[PDB]
Structures are given as structure tokens and as C-alpha cells.
């Protein structure tokens, strides 16, 4: 099998055209797709990538595998650029994009052999695509199913199953979800997004792991500067002054020696050095700041006034924690005072407007908890465990679990995965084809069938018999797609997918197998474009 020595089109080069190049188009795109086929899904297998020097790496990342894939035939380079567009726009799914594109091209060649002109295949595929996206819009949903049941628990419980914290996952899976649900924010103009960083995590060795604490607001890893300060202050309405600038007796200069000879100078120096910070305290008290959090520390004279005023002053704060309190409470940090060369703490602008701040005892540890405030989208978790060594691993797992759940929640519109989209489109589009009765009926049918390569590949990679796993999907989805077109229902059970671990068909919505809709819409659209780009090439000339 080869093509050369055309000895025609008298040119300084080769000519390959017709069925010859079309056969190469199929072989090339299959050869590339086979590279990533075996890695599809969390149960797939990895491969070694060997360079030209003598080194290699092992990975199952489709983006890395395709990036390091040596592609010679131009027909396969179409799939390389296909993947690059997916990686730049979406950043994931490139494996399924290449796999579908190859299956579309292969089947397209069969249509050509059956006397279906490539122009009618290209059009028919695009007709199926436009309808396929309309279908997905009727399947997708927003973040739902949190009343009487919760699907995010299956997300969190899965993510932590690899970590020490998973031993108590039936408890901690709720800590992950309940915490993250509390920190939904709006950013600007109603984005409705979860922060990339949220849910401050502390630790304590006080009690058993199942006694970990869920705090409705921010937990500050500090205590009151003085044990004489209240542990519960201003339950009605409390203000937090978050400062960086010090309240430690001022130094006039680090490089100047002060030499005091005149008793009058003693008064001038003593009052000035203390006055700088004591006058600031007066402004902190007058602004209502019954909680005062300073990064660079507070002097003892300054603390005394705070104690007498029943103000929960704190010294040696971590600036990062104050940025979290300030932002969460609507405030900005006092890094300096100005406002036309004056001095103030900027009441209601640099002070947080909170409901109540307390200091809590965690059985041989302590911290300050902020319960509520006008508008924050903040929360904190304090993990407990066997010891500090286990607490480190538990914290690391919580950070991982929150990231996994967040990624799912970040996509305002999600559609079940596991083959739900491809299997559902297979049946729906097959019915669509019956409304044509010309040429596109065949292109639509083959387009629909091509999508089954995904649930088929997933089943094979799971070591399960695809002839049962995929066939069962067609049965379950057919039931939903036989009822759907009649608009007759009372209860409608759809979106069945592959459980690639146990080897059974499950309801993916409750199981929690979700993929962003933007991934599925752009993955399906992109896969067609590569198929068309290859199918349009019936001639290659090499000079």
C-alpha cells in the first residue's frame, strides 16, 4: 500500500488524487486517533513518549501526548491543529475531540464509496451538528438537586478517597460541599462564580476528626492580644479595623541618635514617640472598631486603652488573613493614613461591618471566629484529626476536594457525562435523519453513529464488554427519546451513563458525572471541522 510515480501532470513533483488520497486520509486520521483512544477516561491507560535523544516520559494527558506526537502525513496534521484549538479555547477534552473527528472521517469515506458526494456529506454533517447542539441545550441544567438530596457529596467523597481524610468521608464530604456552597460570590455584574481561593482552613488536635468545625464566616488564626479582652463583643453590631501600620511606640529614625539634655526635651520626645500611635488608637476607638487587627503589632500602652474600652485588639496578624477579612467584610486594609494629610481609620470604608466576633476554644487551641457580615461569601473550616501529621494531609485533601467541586460548580450550565451526551444524540439524531429523505439522511445517520465511539472506547478502557455497556445505554436512552417527541410524560428518567469502575449503567445526574456544556458544545463542533478539512482534500501535490 503506497502511492507514487504518477508520471502525469508533467510537473517537478508528485501527484496523488482520488480514492488513493482518500484511503490515506482514513489511515492517517485513524493512526493519530489510535494514539489517544486508549487514554480516554479515568480508567484509561498511559503511554511512553520517546524523544530523539534517548529520554522518555510516561503520561495519559491527551494534550501532552498529542503535542509530542510525531505526525508526518499532512492529513494527520489537521488533527494536530484541531487539538491545539481545543486546548487553547477549552483546555480539556482534546482526547474525545480527536477520537470523534477520526470516526466521522472514516465513516465519511464509506459514504463516498456509496456514491454520496463529499459536498453532501459535509453539508449533512453540519446539519446534524446544528441540531445536535440544539438537543444538548434541552438536556443541560444549572446547579440543582440540593433539596432533599445532594449530588456534590458524590463529587467530594470521590475526590478525597485517595487521601487519609477519606476514612471519614461520610462526614467530611459534607464539610467540603457545605463549606464551598457558602462562598458563592458575584464578582462584577453578576458573574455568579465561586472564588479560585475560598474556605480558609485551620487545624486543631483537640478532638476526634468527626468533631471538625464548620464556621459560617472567616476563622482568623489569632487570639486577643491580652487575656483581659472580651471573647464575645458587640453581638448587635461589631466593626473590624484591619491595619498594617504599627501601633508600636514610634521611632523617629533608625539612623539618628537622640541626645536629650534639657528637661523640656524629655517631655517633647516622650509625648511625641508615644503620641504618634496613641492618637491613632483614639481614632480607632472613635470609629467604633471593637475588633482591631494590626499586622506590625501593638504597644502595651495602646493595648491598655483597647482593654479598658473592651476592644478585641490583636497584634502580630498575618497580612494575608487580614486581606481575607477586609475583602470579605467590605473593607480595605489601612496600609497608611492620608485623606489630605490627616489621620483616620476611614469608618465604614476600611472597617468591616460584621454581626459578631468571638474567640473560641478548640480544646487546647484557640482562634477568633467572625460569624456574619452584610455581604461576604466567606467561610472557614477547622479540621481535627489523629495528630499534626494527619492534620497536614487532611488539610491538603480538603484543598483538593474544594478544587474538584469548585470546577464542577464554576460551569453555570452542566450536562451529564459518561456517554450520556453521545448516546442521547445517537438516538435523537437517528430520528432527525428520518425527516430528510434525500441525501443528508445518510450523513446524519453516520454522524449520529460516529458519536458512539466515545461510550464504546470508555467501556473498552474500563475492561468491560462494550457490546453490553453501550447497548444498554441505547435501550435506556431510547426509552427517553421515544417519549420525548410526543410531549407525554409524568416522570422522565434520562441521562444514563457508564460506571467505569463497577461495570454497570447508572443515573449520572445522581452519580455526579458532570461535564461543562461549553466543553461538549465546542468539542462536538470542533471535531466536525477537522473531518470537513480532511474530507475536502481529494488531491495532494508534492514539489
Amino acid at each position: 500500500f503506497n502511492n507514487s510515480r504518477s508520471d502525469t501532470l508533467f510537473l517537478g513533483g508528485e501527484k496523488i488524487s482520488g480514492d488513493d488520497i482518500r484511503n490515506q486520509n482514513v489511515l492517517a486520521t485513524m493512526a493519530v486517533a489510535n494514539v489517544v483512544k486508549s487514554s480516554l477516561g479515568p480508567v484509561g491507560l498511559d503511554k511512553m513518549l520517546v524523544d530523539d535523544i534517548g529520554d522518555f516520559t510516561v503520561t495519559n494527558d491527551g494534550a501532552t501526548i498529542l503535542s509530542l506526537l510525531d505526525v508526518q502525513h499532512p492529513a494527520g496534521k489537521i488533527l494536530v491543529e484541531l487539538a491545539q484549538q481545543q486546548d487553547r479555547e477549552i483546555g480539556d477534552g482534546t482526547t474525545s475531540v480527536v477520537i470523534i473527528a477520526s470516526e466521522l472521517l472514516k465513516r465519511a469515506n464509506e459514504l463516498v464509496k456509496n456514491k454520496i458526494h463529499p459536498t453532501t456529506i459535509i453539508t449533512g454533517f453540519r446539519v446534524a451538528l446544528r441540531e445536535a447542539i440544539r438537543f444538548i441545550n434541552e438536556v443541560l441544567s444549572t446547579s440543582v438537586d440540593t433539596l432533599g438530596k445532594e449530588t456534590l457529596i458524590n463529587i467530594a467523597k470521590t475526590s478525597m478517597s485517595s487521601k487519609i481524610i477519606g476514612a471519614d468521608s461520610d462526614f467530611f464530604s459534607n464539610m467540603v460541599v457545605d463549606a464551598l456552597l457558602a462562598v458563592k460570590t458575584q464578582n462584577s455584574k453578576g458573574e455568579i462564580k465561586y472564588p479560585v481561593k475560598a474556605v480558609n482552613v485551620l487545624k486543631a488536635h483537640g478532638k476526634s476528626a468527626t468533631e471538625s468545625l464548620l464556621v459560617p464566616g472567616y476563622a482568623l488564626n489569632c487570639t486577643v492580644a491580652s487575656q483581659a479582652m472580651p471573647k464575645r463583643i458587640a453581638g448587635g453590631n461589631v466593626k473590624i479595623a484591619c491595619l498594617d501600620l504599627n501601633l508600636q511606640k514610634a521611632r523617629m529614625a533608625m539612623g539618628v541618635q537622640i541626645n536629650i539634655d534639657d528637661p523640656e526635651q524629655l517631655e517633647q520626645i516622650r509625648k511625641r514617640e508615644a503620641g504618634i500611635v496613641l492618637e491613632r488608637v483614639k481614632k480607632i476607638i472613635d470609629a467604633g472598631a471593637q475588633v482591631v487587627l494590626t499586622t506590625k503589632g501593638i504597644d502595651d500602652l495602646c493595648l491598655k486603652e483597647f482593654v479598658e474600652a473592651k476592644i478585641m485588639g490583636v497584634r502580630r496578624c498575618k497580612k494575608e488573613d487580614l486581606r481575607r477579612i477586609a475583602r470579605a467584610t467590605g473593607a480595605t486594609l489601612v496600609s497608611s493614613m492620608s485623606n489630605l494629610e490627616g489621620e483616620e481609620t476611614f469608618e465604614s470604608s476600611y472597617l468591616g461591618l460584621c454581626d459578631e466576633v468571638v474567640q473560641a476554644k478548640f480544646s487546647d487551641d484557640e482562634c477568633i471566629l467572625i460569624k456574619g457580615t452584610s455581604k461576604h461569601s466567606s467561610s472557614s473550616i477547622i479540621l481535627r484529626g489523629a495528630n499534626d501529621y494527619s492534620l497536614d494531609e487532611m488539610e491538603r485533601s480538603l484543598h483538593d476536594s474544594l478544587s474538584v467541586v469548585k470546577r464542577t460548580l464554576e460551569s453555570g450550565n452542566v450536562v451529564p457525562g459518561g456517554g450520556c451526551v453521545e448516546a442521547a444524540l445517537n438516538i435523537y439524531l437517528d430520528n432527525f435523519a428520518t425527516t430528510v429523505g434525500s441525501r443528508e439522511q445518510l450523513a446524519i445517520a453516520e454522524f449520529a453513529a460516529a458519536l458512539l465511539i466515545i461510550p464504546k472506547t470508555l467501556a473498552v478502557n474500563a475492561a468491560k464488554d462494550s457490546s453490553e455497556l453501550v447497548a444498554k445505554l441505547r435501550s435506556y436512552h431510547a426509552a427517553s427519546q421515544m417519549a420525548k417527541p410526543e410531549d407525554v410524560k409524568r416522570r422522565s428518567y434520562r441521562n444514563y451513563g457508564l460506571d467505569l469502575i463497577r461495570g454497570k449503567i447508572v443515573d449520572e445526574i445522581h452519580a455526579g458525572v458532570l461535564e461543562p456544556t461549553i466543553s461538549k458544545v465546542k468539542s462536538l463542533k470542533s471535531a466536525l471541522e477537522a473531518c470537513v478539512a480532511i474530507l475536502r482534500i481529494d488531491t495532494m501535490i508534492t514539489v
Partner: protein, 518 residues
């Protein structure tokens, strides 16, 4: 170019079997020799499993993984190099009829292997015996196992003592319900630094508790030792002082150069007088020290050490008590060298040393090695490292496992019995590990010269009905108890060996495709 499917699977197992075969008969006290022909026309007969694997070229990526596998083992545990390679290869061989002929998907074999690891690790614990890692005499008897038939065996009391003091100094020996049990974290790679100094003999090796500097001073001739030291750690240079402005010094007229030197002389003197206020015995400056500064400080009876990086002063402060300050005027009267017997500046082998030892242990030590030649020093260093490695391996966990193939045999028997209750497809590849473990007691018999079946069959019967501490006698080839024939090995070797061997097998079994490209 590209190999896929069962061809990739066979290639991965085949290459792994080859690497295991290269050193198969290099295990045991009676290890055989291997003739390695060098491209340059020479050849060696080395039986060193590391050198043999290092000095043989391989092509298959799977073989290259096994080469890196041995490097990982060496970094984690000071032994087990050849055990990991042999076991890892045999596991893949035993998985071969299951992967190819029985058509069992890799995901099933890998899952079964992970369960076999879990069970094997528990068995290794069950057959272990405790040791008292606080009893130095008990540890010396174990440490000598790594010193036998080495040059320094005649001084093994010193090699053990150094290993005991070095490891215990860095060992985190703690247990509580707050921080948790560190499991005797030991770092003999960085915190027990070893230095070879010409002169002396093996017995003259010493352990230092503090900081040793190799940097020379402005006056190499210094009092032999300081009984009342005071150390100054100062960043600020001792040179012409400039302000905070961007002002440059530009001199054109030849007569005007004296203006800058005269100013520098006064400023440098004043800085040095501030240093001398605390009556130092050693002044260390991180930035430069002018010629005048060196004279002002030296003439007072004080050593001066210039251009010392912060990374040194940070350690010097921990063993001297000196405060590190920026400006010369920031130095404190508390900058003293108390809680120290003496500081020593003795030159050894015509090389300057500064010993900053004190009565404190800053979680670290340094070992001084002595000898009449570099060859002696190298033998002491290499042999001490073995003593430290085994001292770490034992003090990492107060448990030993029986050697002579006993532990590996016990794992095989216990896995085989466990297989009886492991109903399902995983039962098949699960057995693969139980059979693979035999590669150790089989190799010992092959080197002894006995029948690999008849002698192994006697061993298996002893484990089936008797105790798990039965092994192969290295010299006689007989099946003997490891109680009379101690041959005990730190448990960490057997735990890491089965762990890394199975994990490697699981990796290569996962690779159904090898793809070239850049």
C-alpha cells in the same frame, strides 16, 4: 517508531526480564562474577549489581525505567538495590501468561498487584522481630553487619560509634498525640556531613558538635585555642562610608586622592573601634574588609574573617550565640561565645581549620576522618557511610526481618493462602506475586549449587508447617533456621523492596503503547 498493543506489553515484560537476568546471579553472599566488555577494549569482572546495571547499555524504555528504579531505591534505602530489580522483573514475568495468554486486562492485573502489595507488607511485619534502638551495644552488633570484610573492620567500634552518634543526633525520636510520631526521621545525607582530612589513622576519626569552617583568616597564626571566645557577625563592610545619595567619587587631580583615603581611614577606624568595644576574639564580616580594617582589628589580638556568606553566619550563630546584625553600631555586648569549651584553629595537613564546636547539638554533626593517605581516607569514608546507612535503616524502625530468603518465602506462602479467599478474576494475577517472591530463595540455592526444586520444596514445607524464620545457608546451601544463623536485615529493606518492585511492575503493565516523537 511506534509499538502498540500486546507487542508493547510483551516488549515491556521482555526488556524487564532481561535487566533482571543481567544480575540474577549477583545476589547473595556467594554472588557470581559478571564479565563486562568495555567498548574501549578493557573488561571487568565486577559483581557489583549497581555498576553492572550502570555500565550496560539498554535500548528499551522499560529497561531504562528499571535502571532509574534502582537509583530510587538507593536514595530511599541504603540497600535492596538488586532485590528490587530481580523481584520487579519476576513479577512481570509471572504476570505474562495472565496478560497475554489469558487475556486479562492490565487494569485487573494492576489492581490485583496493588492488593498483593498490601497483604505482603502486613506479612513482612508479622515475621519481624523487635530490637532496642536505644541500646547502643545491641546496635553496634547490627551495624557491624555492614562493616564485615571491609578494611576498617579492625576499627569497627569507632565506625559504629560514629554512626551511632551521627544518626541519634539527627534522629527525631518522639511520640505523642499532638504532633504525632515522626517514625524516627533520619537524614544522614546532609546533617552528618563527612570531611576527609589528611593525617592520622582510622582510630583518630572524631565527631564534631557545631560548625566547622574551611575559610582562611587574615592572620593564619593564631592562639591554638580560645577559652573565652566572643564572635562578631556583621554584614556592614569596613570601608569608605557612603551616604544614601547617588553621589559617585570622581578624582582627576593626582593630589586629591589623599582626601578619600584620609576620610576612609577615620571612618574605618571608628567602625573597627565599635567592633572592638565588645572585646572580640573572632570578627566575621559578610561584606569586604579594607586593608586598614584588617590591621585595626588584628592588632588588638583578634582573628578577622572576611567575605563570609550569610548561609554560613546563620549556622555560626546557632553554635556561637552571636547575633547577626546589619550595621556596625547594631552589635551587642551579648555577642559572646559562652557555653563552649574552646574554639580551635589547629592546622591539620598544612590546611587551616576553624572549629566552632560547643556544648550544644544543633540537630546536626560533622565527622572528621583521618588517615595516612587519601586511599585510607576514602576507604574510611565509604565504609562509614555503610555504617551510617544500616544505622539509619535500623533506627528508622525498631524491627528486623529474617534474611536468607526467609522473609520472601513467608510472603509467598501467606499470599498463596490469602489467594484462597480472593474469589474473582483478580485471583489469577494475584498469585503472580506469590510465585515471584521465590526468585530470592531460588537465586540463593542456585549460587549454593543445589537443586532449585528439591531444596526450595524443603524450604516451602518448613514454612508451611513450621516457623517463618527458615532460610538458606549461604555457605552450605542447607535449609537452616535464621535464629542460629542470624542473617537479620533491617525491615525497611524488605518493606521498600516489595513496595517499589510491585509499583514498577504496575507502571510497565499500564503501558500498552510506546510512541516516538519530539
Amino acid at each position: 517508531e511506534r509499538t502498540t498493543g500486546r507487542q508493547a506489553q510483551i516488549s515491556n515484560i521482555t526488556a524487564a526480564k532481561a535487566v533482571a537476568d543481567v544480575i540474577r546471579t549477583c545476589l547473595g553472599p556467594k554472588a557470581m562474577l559478571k564479565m563486562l566488555l568495555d567498548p574501549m577494549g578493557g573488561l571487568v569482572l565486577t559483581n557489583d549489581g549497581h555498576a553492572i546495571l550502570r555500565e550496560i547499555d539498554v535500548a528499551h524504555p522499560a529497561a531504562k525505567s528499571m535502571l532509574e528504579l534502582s537509583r530510587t531505591q538507593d536514595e530511599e534505602v541504603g540497600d535492596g538495590t538488586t532485590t528490587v530489580i530481580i523481584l520487579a522483573g519476576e513479577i512481570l514475568a509471572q504476570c505474562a501468561p495472565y496478560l497475554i495468554e489469558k487475556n486479562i486486562h492490565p487494569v485487573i492485573i494492576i489492581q490485583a498487584l496493588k492488593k498483593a502489595l498490601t497483604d505482603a507488607l502486613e506479612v513482612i511485619k508479622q515475621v519481624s522481630k523487635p530490637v532496642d534502638v536505644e541500646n547502643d551495644a545491641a546496635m553496634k552488633k547490627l551495624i557491624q553487619a555492614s562493616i564485615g570484610t571491609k578494611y576498617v573492620i579492625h576499627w569497627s567500634e569507632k565506625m559504629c560509634e560514629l554512626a551511632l552518634d551521627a544518626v541519634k543526633t539527627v534522629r527525631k525520636d518522639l511520640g505523642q498525640t499532638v504532633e504525632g510520631e515522626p517514625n524516627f526521621e533520619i537524614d544522614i545525607k546532609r546533617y552528618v556531613r563527612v570531611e576527609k582530612i589528611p593525617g592520622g589513622d582510622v582510630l583518630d576519626s572524631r565527631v564534631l558538635k557545631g560548625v566547622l569552617l574551611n575559610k582562611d583568616v587574615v592572620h593564619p597564626k593564631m592562639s591554638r585555642h580560645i577559652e573565652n571566645p566572643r564572635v562578631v557577625l556583621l554584614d556592614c563592610p569596613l570601608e569608605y562610608k557612603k551616604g544614601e545619595s547617588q553621589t559617585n567619587i570622581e578624582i582627576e587631580k593626582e593630589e586629591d586622592w589623599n582626601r578619600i583615603l584620609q576620610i576612609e581611614e577615620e571612618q574605618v577606624q571608628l567602625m573597627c573601634e565599635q567592633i572592638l568595644a565588645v572585646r572580640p576574639t573572632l570578627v566575621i564580616t559578610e561584606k569586604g574588609v579594607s586593608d586598614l580594617a584588617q590591621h585595626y582589628l588584628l592588632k588588638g589580638g583578634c582573628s578577622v574573617l572576611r567575605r563570609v556568606k550569610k548561609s554560613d553566619n546563620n549556622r555560626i550563630a546557632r553554635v556561637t550565640g552571636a547575633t547577626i546584625v546589619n550595621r556596625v553600631e547594631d552589635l551587642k555586648e551579648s555577642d559572646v561565645g559562652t557555653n563552649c569549651g574552646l574554639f580551635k584553629v589547629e592546622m591539620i595537613g598544612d590546611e587551616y581549620f576553624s572549629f566552632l564546636d560547643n556544648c550544644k547539638e544543633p540537630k546536626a554533626c560533622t565527622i572528621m576522618l583521618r588517615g595516612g593517605s587519601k586511599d585510607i581516607l576514602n576507604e574510611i569514608d565509604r565504609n562509614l557511610q555503610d555504617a551510617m546507612a544500616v544505622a539509619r535503616n535500623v533506627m528508622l524502625s525498631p524491627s528486623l526481618s529474617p534474611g536468607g530468603g526467609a522473609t520472601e518465602m513467608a510472603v509467598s506462602v501467606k499470599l498463596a493462602e490469602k489467594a484462597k479467599q480472593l474469589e474473582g478474576i483478580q485471583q489469577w494475577p494475584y498469585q503472580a506475586v506469590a510465585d515471584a517472591m521465590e526468585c530470592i530463595p531460588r537465586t540463593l540455592i542456585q549460587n549454593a549449587g543445589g537443586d532449585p526444586i528439591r531444596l526450595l520444596s524443603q524450604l516451602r514445607a518448613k514454612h508451611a508447617q513450621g516457623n517463618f524464620t527458615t532460610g538458606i545457608d549461604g555457605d552450605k546451601g542447607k535449609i537452616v533456621d535464621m535464629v542460629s544463623y542470624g542473617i537479620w536485615e533491617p525491615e525497611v529493606i524488605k518493606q521498600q523492596s516489595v513496595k517499589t518492585a510491585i509499583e514498577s511492575a504496575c507502571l510497565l503493565l499500564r503501558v500498552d503503547d510506546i510512541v516516538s516523537g519530539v
